[PDB]
Amino acid sequence: SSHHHHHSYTVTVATGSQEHAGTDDYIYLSLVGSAGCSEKHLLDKGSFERGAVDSYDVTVDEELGEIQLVRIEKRKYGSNDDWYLKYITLKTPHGDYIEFPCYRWITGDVEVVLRDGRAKLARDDQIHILKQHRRKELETRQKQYRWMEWNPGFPLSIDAKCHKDLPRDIQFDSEKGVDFVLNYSKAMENLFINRFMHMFQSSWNDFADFEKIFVKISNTISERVMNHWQEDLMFGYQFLNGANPVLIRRCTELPEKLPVTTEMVECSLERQLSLEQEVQQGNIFIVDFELLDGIDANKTDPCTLQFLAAPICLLYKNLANKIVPIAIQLNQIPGDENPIFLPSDAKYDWLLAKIWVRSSDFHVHQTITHLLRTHLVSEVFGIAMYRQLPAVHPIFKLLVAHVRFTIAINTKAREQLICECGLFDKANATGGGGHVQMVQRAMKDLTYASLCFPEAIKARGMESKEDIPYYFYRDDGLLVWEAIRTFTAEVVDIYYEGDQVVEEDPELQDFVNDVYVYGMRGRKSSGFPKSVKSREQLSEYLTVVIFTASAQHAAVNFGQYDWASWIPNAPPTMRAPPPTAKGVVTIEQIVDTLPDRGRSCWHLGAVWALSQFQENELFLGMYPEEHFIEKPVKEAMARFRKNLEAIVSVIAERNENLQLPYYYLSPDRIPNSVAI
Ligand SMILES: [Fe+2]
Incomplete structure (x- = not known):
């Protein structure tokens, strides 16, 4: 993977591993020092290949001082070949090793200037x-x-x-x-x-x-x-x-919009406490989809009517410390055509109620x-x-x-x-x-x-x-x-x-x-x-x-x-x-x-x-x-x-x-x- 080019600084250039990281265009590089910039040096002439690390001996016409920046320019060769530059390092005349992180795509659109890491x-x-x-x-x-x-x-x-x-x-x-x-x-x-x-x-x-x-x-x-x-x-x-x-929360009091009673869910409770007392013990939880209430259902297919609910699901931490559903109201506003389903209902009433909550989730x-x-x-x-x-x-x-x-x-x-x-x-x-x-x-x-x-x-x-x-x-x-x-x-x-x-x-x-x-x-x-x-x-x-x-x-x-x-x-x-x-x-x-x-x-x-x-x-x-x-x-x-x-x-x-x-x-x- 490593290609050394000998004619000073030792300039190492690491191309990316991505599929299209390589380029075949001209790459010019200059060094910006405190004491002055360098010339624009063309590199390689050949191709920078995917995964490659190319180093170069670069002799400069004047003392530059401490290197502050590195400029990179990509001039076109044939068609435009994007170039992913991972980084550039330098071994300066005075023996210093400096790394310049890049990790950027270099399209010819503009000069890229890097700081040391x-x-x-x-x-x-x-x-x-x-x-x-x-x-x-x-x-x-x-x-x-x-x-x-x-x-x-x-x-x-x-x-x-x-x-x-x-x-x-x-x-x-x-x-x-x-x-x-x-x-x-x-x-x-x-x-x-x-x-x-x-x-x-x-x-x-x-x-x-x-x-x-x-x-x-x-x-x-x-x-x-x-x-x-x-x-x-x-x-x-x-x-x-x-x-x-991320939706469930411990219920500290029953919502008025869910008129559920101890009698309705007595069969699910297991501590001989009323529902209300169960709530105060911290054993009742709730998942409430008021957000879905009012959301337009999908009408993009005129041949299929689609439907949304906005259920309130009441749950219960039983004696085994498992949380289980004990009541489900599929819409927000209580009423006669908005029943509170229970596990004691007909098999498929309760199942369908749970399906609606799963769909809302x-x-x-x-x-x-x-x-x-x-x-x-x-x-x-x-x-x-x-x-x-x-x-x-x-x-x-x-x-x-x-x-x-x-x-x-x-x-x-x-x-x-x-x-x-x-x-x-x-x-x-x-x-x-x-x-x-x-x-x-x-x-x-x-x-x-x-x-x-x-x-x-x-x-x-x-x-x-x-x-x-x-x-x-x-x-x-x-x-x-x-x-x-x-x-x-x-x-x-x-x-x-x-x-x-x-x-x-x-x-x-x-x-x-x-x-x-x-x-x-x-x-x-x-x-x-x-x-x-x-x-x-x-x-x-x-x-x-x-x-x-x-x-x-x-x-x-x-x-x-x-x-x-x-x-x-x-x-x-x-x-x-x-x-x-x-x-x-x-x-x-x-x-x-x-x-x-x-x-x-x-x-x-x-x-x-x-x-x-x-x-x-x-x-x-x-x-x-x-x-x-x-x-x-x-x-x-x-x-x-x-x-x-x-x-x-x-x-x-x-x-x-x-x-x-x-x-x-x-x-x-x-x-x-x-x-x-
Ligand atoms: Fe995602």
């Missing part, structure tokens, strides 16, 4: 050569990465209509690297359900019929779901350890828990980072690894998936505009506190490990959150002497302020910091960014196929309205209410595709791109990895004793960033 705050740069580069870099970043309102009331996002319009730096490594159109269809072929992709009018004949298709493609967990999805235990299990375990999962609260939020942090933090800034170096491909995957999504007439309209009952309504309404109550994991759990009354023992999403989440809190606190303490340095960092303040004003639209009730004025506050802020982008997203993303592939346990749509009376529903009707073959197929394709890890996935703590090069921060990273390794073992041992292991938050399965 030591992270510097603005206050560290007092000479004109550095200050000018720093200021000019931010000017360029702010012309290149702009905010834009994609839909009314959304967090602001990148100013680009489609993926190819993005700056090359933040695009996927290929144009079809991660593609919703391509990956969904390929998914459907590998699941052998390709023939169903347009059967939007054909119901399954029965559960045996869908099951015929499903046994061929089930995995460990979804097969468990196939065999146990009708059980109250599995139903309640998912609110804690399923694909979307799915809608809120897709759009709010997943899209808004990890994807869109992570893009807000990413854009603000690019706009306000130069590459030499320690916080840029820290965060860039954790917003990798985030803007790219989100732009792909707005281009193909969630736009008008996107893939999302095919199977989802909220498709066609409802999902946009959900984001707008959830946005009004998206807060900074709700992204702080420990507080969020506490706010939902689910913090007690003693009272609520089997909340594995909570337990593991807390371990990983604390591991990140530890790592960010350490990095902050290295580069910030005190709280006053944090407060006076104008680029940090502008980063935080962009997130607040543009990202979060300047809504006062968002609770986001307008500024950050202590190392402790900065540490927490950075943990919010990193945790949301890695752990939180992993928790709510990679369990989609496990739990949703068996469709009756996560219907993306319902083709009949919720039952208004008891004693009417039949199993045949349920099969016709569940999604047809066409929507089942697009649903399966989607949840499989989104749950895949890429071959060379970068998991939490893996930083192959060395933006940081200093010993102290490198050791902080090493401690981060060891701390994470310990968590992997804690979680593994914990899982050996579980009927159904929970591993979405095992750090070795948590990607660095939102990339799918």
Whole structure:
């Protein structure tokens, strides 16, 4: 891989490993020293190949002094061949070894100028050569990465209509690297359900019929779901350890909108206490989908009426400390045509009620828990980072690894998936505009506190490990959150002497302020910091960014196929309205209410595709791109990895004793960033 060119400085250039990293164009390189610049030297003449490391002997016509910058220029040879430059190092005449991190695509469009890898705050740069580069870099970043309102009331996002319009730096490594159109269809072929992709009018004949298709493609967990999805235990299990375990909260008093009585649920209670007394003991929990109330159902297919509920599900921590459903009201306003279903009802009344709650859980999962609260939020942090933090800034170096491909995957999504007439309209009952309504309404109550994991759990009354023992999403989440809190606190303490340095960092303040004003639209009730004025506050802020982008997203993303592939346990749509009376529903009707073959197929394709890890996935703590090069921060990273390794073992041992292991938050399965 290593090609040395001998005719001074020794200039090493490392090309990227990506498919199209190589270039065959001319590469000129000059050195900017305190005592003066150098000449523009052409390099190689040949080709810089994928994975290559080329070094050169470069003799200069005058003494340059200490090297401050390195300029790179790509002039065309034949056609335009993009070039991914990982980094450049120098062995100077005086024997110094200097590394210049890059990790950028170099299209001929403009000269690329690099700092040496030591992270510097603005206050560290007092000479004109550095200050000018720093200021000019931010000017360029702010012309290149702009905010834009994609839909009314959304967090602001990148100013680009489609993926190819993005700056090359933040695009996927290929144009079809991660593609919703391509990956969904390929998914459907590998699941052998390709023939169903347009059967939007054909119901399954029965559960045996869908099951015929499903046994061929089930995995460990979804097969468990196939065999146990009708059980109250599995139903309640998912609110804690399923694909979307963030909605349930301890009920401190029954809502007036749910007129449920002790008599109605006496058969479920097991401590000889009334329902009301049970609530006061802290044994009653609730999942309430008031958000779905008023959301427009998908009408893009005039031949299929699709339907949404907005249920209130009451649950109960029984004597075995398992949480189970004891009552379900499918809509918000109590009444005669809005029955409170119970486990003591006819078999299929209770089953269908649970199916509607599972379907509602799915809608809120897709759009709010997943899209808004990890994807869109992570893009807000990413854009603000690019706009306000130069590459030499320690916080840029820290965060860039954790917003990798985030803007790219989100732009792909707005281009193909969630736009008008996107893939999302095919199977989802909220498709066609409802999902946009959900984001707008959830946005009004998206807060900074709700992204702080420990507080969020506490706010939902689910913090007690003693009272609520089997909340594995909570337990593991807390371990990983604390591991990140530890790592960010350490990095902050290295580069910030005190709280006053944090407060006076104008680029940090502008980063935080962009997130607040543009990202979060300047809504006062968002609770986001307008500024950050202590190392402790900065540490927490950075943990919010990193945790949301890695752990939180992993928790709510990679369990989609496990739990949703068996469709009756996560219907993306319902083709009949919720039952208004008891004693009417039949199993045949349920099969016709569940999604047809066409929507089942697009649903399966989607949840499989989104749950895949890429071959060379970068998991939490893996930083192959060395933006940081200093010993102290490198050791902080090493401690981060060891701390994470310990968590992997804690979680593994914990899982050996579980009927159904929970591993979405095992750090070795948590990607660095939102990339799918
Ligand atoms: Fe995702």
